[PDB]
Structure 1
Amino acid sequence: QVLVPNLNPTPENLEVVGDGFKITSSINLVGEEEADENAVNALREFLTANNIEINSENDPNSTTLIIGEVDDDIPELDEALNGTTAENLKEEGYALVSNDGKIAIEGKDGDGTFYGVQTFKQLVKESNIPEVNITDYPTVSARGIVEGFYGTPWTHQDRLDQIKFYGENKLNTYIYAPKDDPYHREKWREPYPESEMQRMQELINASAENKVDFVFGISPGIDIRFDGDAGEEDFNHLITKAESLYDMGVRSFAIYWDDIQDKSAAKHAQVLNRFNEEFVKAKGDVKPLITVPTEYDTGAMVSNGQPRAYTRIFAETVDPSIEVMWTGPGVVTNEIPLSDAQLISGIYDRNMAVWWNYPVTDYFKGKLALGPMHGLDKGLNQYVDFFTVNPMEHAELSKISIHTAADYSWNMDNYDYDKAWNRAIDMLYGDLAEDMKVFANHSTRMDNKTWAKSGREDAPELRAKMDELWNKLSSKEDASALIEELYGEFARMEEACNNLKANLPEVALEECSRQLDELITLAQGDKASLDMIVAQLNEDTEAYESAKEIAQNKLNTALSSFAVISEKVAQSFIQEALSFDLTLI
């Protein structure tokens, strides 16, 4: 009878109180004079998009929408809320009540009001809305993305689209830090050309319109000089560089020390402290300084329960108000258990920031990382106050994983990776969701075979059916039913990928066409591998020898291609099938 639509992030408190109601083609709007401008703009936009007019004069027979903040002078807001408010209720928190023709939205601040509008937009389908009482606020207070990868940086239009996407999903933090922007790191002293400054401006305006904090990152560590007149000259270059962005509206800064040879911990921190003093504190409206030290994962930072020398000196030197990011137990790592966050938090005795290197693929570019947040302790917020993911150079397909990060960082305690992953693809993909899940299911696990591994395993259910096939065959048990089933699975992989090639919008298709072709090749090799097994069981030598040729040729195509998908599953199945001797008789 509505119902409650898919929502992201999952609201903290949601109660269904009624049958639901249709929103009139024309509404009455109250409070839009005092409410958060940004919030109201996002409301107007949605209303316009959905062919909903705003009444110039009040109308009894119309759906009424009331909007404002807690301390705004708005009587009707108090009334339609009927008891529950956002009072109450941390920063970015809000209350939403839909009941019998009225919709009320109240934020603790303007951010909350904006976010209340985002939930509203998600609640309405076909002008119908469920009847609910919502109170909501984030688990973690900074949530977002660091564009911090190697490779082709996101285009200006990519970033503008990403920023709207963060706002819509309650993500409030975007860190500008592309390794391959020359003015970010390689030529960090050099000022941005005019045309690129105008683009930053648009990005900064876009961030503000969406209640996202734009963080200007800089990475001087390759060749910054520390002592004497050169240290003076270089420190001034940092100040100059930050000022140009500040003067455009930037109020958040990051200075980064990763991926460099120099491990002068005291000098790094001293730079951070001087910048913090002469810029951050001196400007007065600037958020805490953000940094990553040269040791940034637990393997690098810690030896036998104790901080290594670099980490030790850095921790003892960097001012307490500076946000320090770390990536977890490893740079690209399976999990962050609570004990790791506890370890690092105690070392720095401060709440930590997380730089999560997933879905980034810059270290294994042939594979797309399409899985949810996976391995992050649901209790991490005890030690972590700031959470960001490093995405792929592929902006559109990063939205799947980013979508889950939004849910993880806003409602951490109830986060369910499988449900969040499904919900992400449903919400992003529409009619194509079921097919996109088939494909993406095979492309969640990242593994470069050495130091870098993270993500949910690829297609775990299918992997379990494959194992059971081998179990039955080696036990000489009848596998006819399981074989018939696996034909069904392989045919479904291929059909799903074909539907995706024919119907994915180009923005999506351009990022994954090769991996799609790759999964089809694999599915075909998997099918032929079944043919090979079935021939061996039928003692049909010629059907063997013909199926095996196909299987091997598909595996060889898959191995020689740039695109990489389903290594431990669709790919490995062929290898397993070719290594299983059923000619033993």
Structure 2
Amino acid sequence: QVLVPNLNPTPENLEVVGDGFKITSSINLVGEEEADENAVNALREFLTANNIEINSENDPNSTTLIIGEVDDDIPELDEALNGTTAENLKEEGYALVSNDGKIAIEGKDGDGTFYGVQTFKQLVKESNIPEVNITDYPTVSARGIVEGFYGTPWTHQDRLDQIKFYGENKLNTYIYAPKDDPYHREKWREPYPESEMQRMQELINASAENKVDFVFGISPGIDIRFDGDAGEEDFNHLITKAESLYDMGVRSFAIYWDDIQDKSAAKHAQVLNRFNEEFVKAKGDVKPLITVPTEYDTGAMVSNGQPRAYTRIFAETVDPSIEVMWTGPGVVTNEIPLSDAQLISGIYNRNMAVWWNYPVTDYFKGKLALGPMHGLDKGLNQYVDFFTVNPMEHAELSKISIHTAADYSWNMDNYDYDKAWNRAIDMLYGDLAEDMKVFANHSTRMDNKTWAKSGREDAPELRAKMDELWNKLSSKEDASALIEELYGEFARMEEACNNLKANLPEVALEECSRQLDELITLAQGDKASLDMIVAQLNEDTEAYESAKEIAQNKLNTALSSFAVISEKVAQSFIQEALSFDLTLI
């Protein structure tokens, strides 16, 4: 339409060049047989879904859609593009032009054509398409998800849905590494049963269809042996287990050393160099080997600007072709400043991979991590060419944070976490988006009270309003308009939560029903907290006492519950109100 819809990720260069036009009921398609197979299917599926027919002939002044790669000799495309091209973009880059009853998609390579089609899909709203000239390409070459958490692994259905979801948002990496799949870690030696294999084949296939590298991770750390013939048999077990997966089409692999006791850096890396030599190089079509060392956060890797002993030997031993992940300054931390990547990258003498622990909640499962990528430097691409997030065991609600990770890593320099976060929920939740924002807003900051802290603060604007209320009140100023405003906010929280319980799809609701009820409880305690303030100002001892018992119950209910939400806002406000003695004349 006239207006450009929400797009994700944010295209590098987009310009509106006209008024927009309505695509016709059937269209002329050019380039099908010569253009990327996966791109065309995704194009077909979108056409089928939106009841847009294809002409088996051509003209009747129907909309023309031209699709192809720069390398193809396609004149209609050249003409339809009219000077703009993907010729000089990086891999996965594309050019899209919609003008005057024509849409032209040109990829730099097949991946770029597929991605062009995803942008086309996001651009079309009720047959209306804006008129734009786009050139697009990612900041970072590897973008995706590592299923690396503890707890119930994603179901097969979950994974397939996730893969399609990655393709649509232009993420190209899925690392299969769940800690509590025994065939990955606890029984890392034994092959998959001849039906978990069938499920593997589907994962592999779906990833191919969506331009996602399926990375198979193995974590031998617990009981692997290195010395003598034990070490040899155990090494062989890696190869046979990897080949078993290569044989069905796995062309990316990871060997992980995270959270084991064994700190033998030379042993770990020689296993990696052995595998890199006798497996990766020998096969010729396997991507760079990926790893994570026993020391994987800056606190664990570094001492006063220098590598620790393990890190030193690992860095100096591991092959330059091997991609090394780290998590940042801590395992779950506020930030990765440019200076942290510079440091670690300097130690390994290369571009690093990030294993980012958000939205993962395995260490603190009562809270859902529902905020955007936050704290990650917008120039990280200077030292990082591989960005993954470790998600929650809750596949569906992970989409929100994943959605924003896709924008951060594709278009890093323009990344706006607030805008990305709003876009994620808008694009995911539709009619329910405004209610979903109210609830998810209260559930962004992860904090286990000890080693793990990350994410945008919960409900900052509400927090600022609460702060404003206390200083108006402790200054003896009129806070009545603010009090009234805060009543509106607490009522609004409870009503959003109720609309969500009533209207969310079950697949999302089964993941958040407890945290929903908890924000309701909290909102009701916040309401009772204002009642306390008002009764005090009014010198009504009775109304105060009654409100205090309610507020105190709601807080106690919240504190005892499994579910955790809004600790520093909705919850703490009640503690603040209980402790504020407004009657001291």
Q: TM-score, normalised by structure 2?
A: 1.00
Alignment pair present for 1:564 and 2:564: yes
1:77 is aligned to 77
Give the match's secondary structure for 2:512. Answer: helix
| Residues 228-255 of structure 1: CA deviation (Å, up to 9, x unaligned) | 1000000000000100000010000000
Q: Give, in angstroms, the shift of residue 581 of structure 1.
A: 1.3
| Residues 381-421 of structure 1: CA deviation (Å, up to 9, x unaligned) | 00000000000000000000000000000000000000000
Q: Give, in angstroms, the shift of residue 74 of structure 1.
A: 1.4
Q: Which shows bigger deviation, 465-474 or 355-364?
A: 465-474
Q: Give, in angstroms, the shift of residue 474 of structure 1.
A: 1.1
1:40 is aligned to 40
| Residues 49-98 of structure 1: CA deviation (Å, up to 9, x unaligned) | 00011110011410010111111121111110000010010100000010
| Residues 472-514 of structure 1: CA deviation (Å, up to 9, x unaligned) | 1111111111100100110010011111111111111110000
Which whole-Å CA distance do the structure 1 matches of 2:25 and 2:481 have between them?
55
Which whole-Å CA distance do the structure 2 matches of 1:3 and 1:484 have between them?
37
Query: 1:20-39, aligned counterparts within 5 Å?
Result: 20-39=20-39
| Residues 208-244 of structure 1: CA deviation (Å, up to 9, x unaligned) | 0000000000000111000110000000000001000
Gaps of 5+ in 2: none
Which whole-Å CA distance do the structure 1 matches of 2:364 and 2:410 have between them?
29
Which whole-Å CA distance do the structure 2 matches of 1:584 and 1:544 have between them?
14
2:321 is aligned to 321
Which whole-Å CA distance do the structure 1 matches of 2:230 and 2:271 have between them?
13
Alignment pair present for 1:429 and 2:429: yes
Which whole-Å CA distance do the structure 2 matches of 1:473 and 1:17 have between them?
54
Q: Give, in angstroms, the shift of residue 424 of structure 1.
A: 0.4
Q: Give, in angstroms, the shift of residue 25 of structure 1.
A: 0.2
Which whole-Å CA distance do the structure 2 matches of 1:159 and 1:549 have between them?
47
Q: Which shows bigger deviation, 60-69 or 378-387?
A: 60-69
Q: Give, in angstroms, the shift of residue 354 of structure 1.
A: 0.2
Which whole-Å CA distance do the structure 1 matches of 2:369 and 2:391 have between them?
9
| Residues 545-584 of structure 1: CA deviation (Å, up to 9, x unaligned) | 1001110011111011100000000000001100111232
| Residues 106-151 of structure 1: CA deviation (Å, up to 9, x unaligned) | 1111000000000000000000000000100000000000000000
Which whole-Å CA distance do the structure 1 matches of 2:582 and 2:19 have between them?
61
Which whole-Å CA distance do the structure 1 matches of 2:77 and 2:218 have between them?
44
Give the match's secondary structure for 2:361. Answer: coil
Q: Give, in angstroms, the shift of residue 2 of structure 1.
A: 1.8
| Residues 282-317 of structure 1: CA deviation (Å, up to 9, x unaligned) | 000000000000000000000010000000000000
Which whole-Å CA distance do the structure 1 matches of 2:279 and 2:77 have between them?
41
Give the match's secondary structure for 1:152. Answer: coil
Which whole-Å CA distance do the structure 2 matches of 1:472 and 1:364 have between them?
36
| Residues 321-358 of structure 1: CA deviation (Å, up to 9, x unaligned) | 00000000000000000000000000000100000000
Give the match's secondary structure for 2:291. Answer: strand
Which whole-Å CA distance do the structure 2 matches of 1:4 and 1:284 have between them?
44
Give the match's secondary structure for 1:396. Answer: helix
Which whole-Å CA distance do the structure 2 matches of 1:61 and 1:288 have between them?
49
Which whole-Å CA distance do the structure 2 matches of 1:581 and 1:133 have between them?
61
Which whole-Å CA distance do the structure 1 matches of 2:335 and 2:278 have between them?
38
Which whole-Å CA distance do the structure 2 matches of 1:455 and 1:239 have between them?
39
Which whole-Å CA distance do the structure 2 matches of 1:242 and 1:573 have between them?
53
Which whole-Å CA distance do the structure 1 matches of 2:560 and 2:307 have between them?
44
How many residue pairs match? The answer is 585
Give the match's secondary structure for 1:222. Answer: coil
Which whole-Å CA distance do the structure 2 matches of 1:412 and 1:305 have between them?
27
1:358 is aligned to 358
| Paired-residue identity, % | 100
Which whole-Å CA distance do the structure 2 matches of 1:411 and 1:204 have between them?
27
2:143 is aligned to 143
| Residues 23-52 of structure 1: CA deviation (Å, up to 9, x unaligned) | 000001111000000000000000000001
Which whole-Å CA distance do the structure 2 matches of 1:119 and 1:306 have between them?
45
Which whole-Å CA distance do the structure 2 matches of 1:116 and 1:145 have between them?
21
Which whole-Å CA distance do the structure 2 matches of 1:201 and 1:135 have between them?
35
Give the match's secondary structure for 1:509. Answer: helix
| Residues 146-175 of structure 1: CA deviation (Å, up to 9, x unaligned) | 000000000000000000000000000000
Alignment pair present for 1:511 and 2:502: no
2:189 is aligned to 189
Which whole-Å CA distance do the structure 2 matches of 1:583 and 1:21 have between them?
65
| Residues 180-213 of structure 1: CA deviation (Å, up to 9, x unaligned) | 0000000000111111011000000000000000
Give the match's secondary structure for 1:397. Answer: helix
Which whole-Å CA distance do the structure 1 matches of 2:21 and 2:220 have between them?
57
Which whole-Å CA distance do the structure 2 matches of 1:413 and 1:515 have between them?
34
2:579 is aligned to 579
Which whole-Å CA distance do the structure 2 matches of 1:465 and 1:117 have between them?
44
Which whole-Å CA distance do the structure 2 matches of 1:478 and 1:83 have between them?
63
Gaps of 5+ in 1: none
2:466 is aligned to 466
Which whole-Å CA distance do the structure 1 matches of 2:544 and 2:523 have between them?
18
Q: TM-score, normalised by structure 1?
A: 1.00
Give the match's secondary structure for 2:425. Answer: helix
Which whole-Å CA distance do the structure 1 matches of 2:116 and 2:579 have between them?
57
Give the match's secondary structure for 1:253. Answer: strand
1:111 is aligned to 111
Which whole-Å CA distance do the structure 1 matches of 2:60 and 2:472 have between them?
70
Which whole-Å CA distance do the structure 1 matches of 2:100 and 2:474 have between them?
64
Which whole-Å CA distance do the structure 1 matches of 2:457 and 2:532 have between them?
27
Runs of 4+ in 1 over 6 A off after TM superposition: none
Which whole-Å CA distance do the structure 2 matches of 1:583 and 1:139 have between them?
58
Which whole-Å CA distance do the structure 1 matches of 2:239 and 2:204 have between them?
19
Which whole-Å CA distance do the structure 1 matches of 2:24 and 2:90 have between them?
33
Give the match's secondary structure for 1:194. Answer: coil
Give the match's secondary structure for 1:385. Answer: strand
Which whole-Å CA distance do the structure 1 matches of 2:400 and 2:2 have between them?
26
| Residues 261-289 of structure 1: CA deviation (Å, up to 9, x unaligned) | 00000000000000000000000000000
Which whole-Å CA distance do the structure 1 matches of 2:466 and 2:379 have between them?
35
Give the match's secondary structure for 2:125. Answer: coil
1:387 is aligned to 387
Which whole-Å CA distance do the structure 2 matches of 1:2 and 1:289 have between them?
47
2:520 is aligned to 520
Which whole-Å CA distance do the structure 2 matches of 1:200 and 1:357 have between them?
25
Which whole-Å CA distance do the structure 2 matches of 1:476 and 1:128 have between them?
56
2:199 is aligned to 199
Which whole-Å CA distance do the structure 1 matches of 2:568 and 2:52 have between them?
50
Which whole-Å CA distance do the structure 2 matches of 1:290 and 1:424 have between them?
29
Which whole-Å CA distance do the structure 2 matches of 1:93 and 1:544 have between them?
63
Give the match's secondary structure for 2:419. Answer: helix
Which whole-Å CA distance do the structure 2 matches of 1:333 and 1:541 have between them?
45
Q: CA RMSD in A?
A: 0.6
